[PDB]
Enzyme design. Structure first.
Site, PDB file in Angstrom:
ATOM      1  N   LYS A  85       0.796  -1.225   0.000  1.00 41.93           N
ATOM      2  CA  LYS A  85       0.000   0.000   0.000  1.00 41.93           C
ATOM      3  C   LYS A  85       0.842   1.298   0.000  1.00 41.93           C
ATOM      4  O   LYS A  85       0.393   2.307   0.529  1.00 41.93           O
ATOM      5  CB  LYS A  85      -1.038   0.018   1.162  1.00 41.93           C
ATOM      6  CG  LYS A  85      -1.976  -1.215   1.238  1.00 41.93           C
ATOM      7  CD  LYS A  85      -2.706  -1.251   2.583  1.00 41.93           C
ATOM      8  CE  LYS A  85      -1.809  -1.766   3.688  1.00 41.93           C
ATOM      9  NZ  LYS A  85      -2.601  -2.012   4.909  1.00 41.93           N
ATOM     10  N   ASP A  99      -4.898  -6.468  10.528  1.00 49.41           N
ATOM     11  CA  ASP A  99      -6.206  -5.818  10.688  1.00 49.41           C
ATOM     12  C   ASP A  99      -7.360  -6.767  10.385  1.00 49.41           C
ATOM     13  O   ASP A  99      -8.415  -6.593  10.969  1.00 49.41           O
ATOM     14  CB  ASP A  99      -6.336  -4.539   9.843  1.00 49.41           C
ATOM     15  CG  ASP A  99      -5.981  -4.646   8.359  1.00 49.41           C
ATOM     16  OD1 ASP A  99      -6.249  -3.698   7.634  1.00 49.41           O
ATOM     17  OD2 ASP A  99      -5.280  -5.607   7.973  1.00 49.41           O
TER      18      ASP A  99
HETATM   19  O1  LIG Z   1      -5.325  -3.381   5.195  1.00 48.87           O
HETATM   20  C1  LIG Z   1      -5.752  -4.442   4.351  1.00 48.87           C
HETATM   21  C2  LIG Z   1      -4.581  -5.279   3.883  1.00 48.87           C
HETATM   22  O2  LIG Z   1      -3.733  -4.416   3.100  1.00 48.87           O
HETATM   23  C3  LIG Z   1      -2.622  -5.087   2.489  1.00 48.87           C
HETATM   24  O3  LIG Z   1      -3.120  -6.109   1.671  1.00 48.87           O
HETATM   25  C4  LIG Z   1      -1.738  -5.728   3.562  1.00 48.87           C
HETATM   26  O4  LIG Z   1      -0.685  -6.452   2.938  1.00 48.87           O
HETATM   27  C5  LIG Z   1      -2.548  -6.627   4.492  1.00 48.87           C
HETATM   28  O5  LIG Z   1      -1.726  -7.076   5.571  1.00 48.87           O
HETATM   29  C6  LIG Z   1      -3.781  -5.901   5.028  1.00 48.87           C
HETATM   30  O6  LIG Z   1      -4.615  -6.801   5.755  1.00 48.87           O
END
Ligand SMILES: OC[C@H]1O[C@H](O)[C@H](O)[C@@H](O)[C@@H]1O
Ligand SMILES: O=C(O)c1ccc(NC(=O)[C@H](CC2CCCC2)n2cnc(C(F)(F)F)c2)nc1
Ligand code: NA
Length: 451
Positions: A162, A198
């Site tokens: 991200k 998360d």
């Molecule tokens: O925030 C939503 C997701 O974003 C990205 O995919 C991260 O790699 C993952 O760990 C997280 O759960």
């Protein structure tokens, strides 16, 4: 000026022909689902784990109980554009105190030291606002990135996703980075007892309300899911008793070419201009960090074909990230009068006609519907695998969900649920939207962990 219903109509027809490329038939979705399931099987097995694009990471969050702790717990949440600190009071849970902090751009892309120093500064700020810096509380850390865990409170960052890019973080113990920054500041003390993804925190918060919740999903900036896997199938962790939550990291599905036939020119452009080219390809089809940008690139293609804005794109329309994902939600929330669409486009330096507004709406619908359908194949793959592993004729399960795309987009949810249902015969899936999930879940897991 610019009338003629016949010509406006022909432009809409050529737009539809271009937009048709986003369509996915039921059979394409079952194909994506089967490929996802195949990758999930690969991620769980010792023999194929290292090569698997879908990591299926053991989280060390187990089916319990136990030994539950009551009282005050601090939750930290890092993984969006914002960082959140929350104080949770657990009795017999209530979000007593909360503060959100915007992370400076220099801290997400600078050094891990700068990022964790900022996090430590925010924790001091929170503790002062509630006069509690002197109290050493157990701390739960929601950290929304791929982590290889050694235990509930120890794990290494595999790689940033991200757009995060802080140096000196990958390959290091994340709890250690946080603990080291708290120590360098020296103005408070905390016992970091758990670190969770998360998706995991969301699942835990929803499970607290409903025990049938054994799946967590995020459709926010990024897109991911976790679920309670049978310990016998978690080959990376010794033991066959009970269950352990597995963080799929499904966003990386497609990184080994598993989505190649579905990737469009817009997808290749988003990927090539991202901070992580060639990574998180499935997430790039769904996540709010990319959705608006996909819409922007479609609009530029329609401008290039002389089908939108008299073939003239404004400076703002040609600016990276200028078509925000929230604009996709606002365009699809338009009641029919085009006022919300007109406003967004006029602010982007465009002079849209009624036809231009309808075309922008169709582009938004095409991208977001595809996001909904791709995401549905992923969730159906997880649920169908669970039904199979549990040897259940009819599996009744609850999925806890968080994220601005799922929660705020006017039709994503409905398109996503309808598609999930089509792909999961013999499953009865309840979806629950979490209320402060990625905060409460980390405190709840810490209450279970502390004793
Ligand atoms: O925030 C939503 C997701 O974003 C990205 O995919 C991260 O790699 C993952 O760990 C997280 O759960
Ligand atoms: O320290 C450790 O090793 C450790 C810590 C905590 C943990 N497991 C839990 O917290 C489970 C997690 C649910 C989530 C879905 C099924 C079990 N829990 C059980 N009850 C809750 C609660 F939220 F409701 F309190 C949470 N596993 C290991
Ligand atoms: Na195991």
């Amino acid at each position: 000026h610019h009338e003629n219903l016949y010509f406006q109509g022909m432009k809409k027809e050529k737009v539809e022909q271009i937009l048709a490329e986003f369509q996915l038939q039921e059979e394409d979705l079952k194909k994506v689902m089967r490929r996802m399931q195949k990758e999930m099987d690969r991620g769980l097995r010792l023999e194929t784990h290292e090569e698997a694009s879908v990591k299926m990471l053991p989280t060390y969050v187990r089916s319990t109980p136990e030994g539950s702790e009551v009282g005050d717990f601090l939750s930290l949440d890092l993984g969006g554009t914002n960082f959140r600190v929350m104080l949770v009071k657990v009795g017999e849970s209530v979000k007593t105190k909360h503060q959100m902090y915007s992370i400076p751009e220099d801290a997400m892309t600078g050094t891990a030291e700068m990022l964790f120093d900022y996090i430590s500064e925010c924790i001091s700020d929170f503790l002062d606002k509630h006069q509690m810096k002197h109290k050493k509380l157990p701390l739960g850390f929601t950290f929304s990135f791929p982590v290889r865990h050694e235990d509930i409170d120890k794990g290494i960052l595999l790689n940033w996703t991200k757009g995060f890019k802080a140096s000196g973080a990958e390959g290091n113990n994340v709890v250690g980075l946080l603990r080291d920054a708290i120590k360098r500041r020296g103005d408070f003390e905390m016992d970091v007892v758990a670190m969770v993804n998360d998706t995991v925190a969301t699942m835990i918060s929803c499970y607290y309300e409903d025990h049938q919740c054994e799946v967590g999903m995020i459709v926010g900036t990024g897109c991911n899911a976790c679920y309670m896997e049978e310990m016998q199938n978690v080959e990376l962790v010794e033991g066959d008793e009970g269950r352990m939550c597995v963080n799929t990291e499904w966003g990386a599905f497609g990184d080994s070419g598993e989505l190649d036939e579905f990737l469009l020119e817009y997808d290749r452009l988003v990927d090539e201009s991202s901070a992580n080219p060639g990574q998180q390809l499935y997430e790039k089809l769904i996540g709010g960090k990319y959705m608006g940008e996909l819409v922007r690139l479609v609009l530029l293609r329609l401008v290039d074909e002389n089908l939108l804005f008299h073939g003239e794109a404004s400076e703002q329309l040609r600016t990276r990230g200028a078509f925000e994902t929230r604009f996709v939600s606002q365009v699809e929330s338009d009641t029919g009068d085009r006022k919300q669409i007109y406003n967004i486009l006029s602010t982007l330096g465009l002079r849209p006609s009624t036809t231009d507004c309808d075309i922008v709406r169709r582009a938004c619908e095409s991208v977001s519907t595809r996001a909904a359908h791709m995401c549905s194949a992923g969730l159906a793959g997880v649920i169908n695998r669970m039904r199979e592993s549990r040897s259940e004729d009819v599996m009744r399960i609850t999925v806890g969900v968080d994220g601005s795309v799922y929660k705020l987009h006017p039709s994503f949810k409905e398109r996503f649920h309808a598609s999930v249902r089509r792909l999961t015969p013999s499953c009865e899936i309840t979806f629950i939207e979490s209320e402060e999930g990625s905060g409460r879940g980390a405190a709840l897991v810490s209450a279970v962990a502390c004793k």
